């Protein structure tokens with residue numbers, strides 16, 4: 001199955017590394033737990049933002065152009081990206097917006113972190129039919145000495 005994992009600021013705004021200001025080690029732990037030993041698919045801009053492969057995961061990068069880094073696997077279409085994951089229980093799609101838009105209709109699960117942070121940005125997580133999705137887990141945390149903002153983890157499954 002295909003899953004999307006994303007961090008959503010106020011108004012479901014999404015973005016890249018330098019554009020997302022919070023410091024949420026708890027969310028990084030959540031992301032790691034939920035993606036480790038699974039293939040991760042990302043767009044080229046997300047790849048450039050991260051700057052180095054995510055360890056212990058197959059990193060698959062979408063780009064219309066030839067690859068430019070042998071440390072990751074490069075593909076030129078959504079269907080090629082999925083095929084490059086092989087036969088695994090769960091494929092993790094880690095954005096960005098253009099990639100989320102394409103994979104959402106194919107996805108069975110969403111892993112969302114709803115962060116109580118107001119950020120500059122025009123880009124939002126794709127609109128999806130709320131009635132298409134059942135919330136199966138959520139867990140709220142206030143900010144603390146390590147985490148700059150309050151945040152809520154949520155898993156939704158397609159119903």
Ligand SMILES: NC(=O)c1ccc[n+]([C@@H]2O[C@H](COP(=O)([O-])OP(=O)(O)OC[C@H]3O[C@@H](n4cnc5c(N)ncnc54)[C@H](OP(=O)(O)O)[C@@H]3O)[C@@H](O)[C@H]2O)c1
Nearest residue numbers: 043044045046062063064076077078095096097098099123
């Ligand atoms: N300044 C602003 O107001 C503003 C607003 C919104 C976004 N942005 C910028 O936009 C970028 C983030 O956009 P994003 O989150 O949408 O990026 P993303 O999903 O991480 O990456 C998009 C890239 O992935 C590749 N890709 C996606 N689908 C593909 C497909 N089906 N086949 C082949 N390649 C595919 C393309 O790479 P190739 O280009 O290599 O073909 C595409 O340009 C950042 O650089 C951000 O700064 C800026």
Ligand SMILES: Nc1nc(=O)c2c([nH]1)NC[C@H](CCc1ccc(C(=O)N[C@@H](CCC(=O)O)C(=O)O)cc1)C2
Nearest residue numbers: 005006007027028029031032050054055094095113
């Ligand atoms: N839950 C979640 N949080 C986020 O901030 C993001 C998503 N999802 N999805 C898309 C994008 C992912 C950004 C992103 C980039 C690098 C690492 C990373 O380096 N993670 C390491 C652990 C880092 C640490 O332990 O400090 C990892 O091994 O997963 C995590 C997230 C932003």
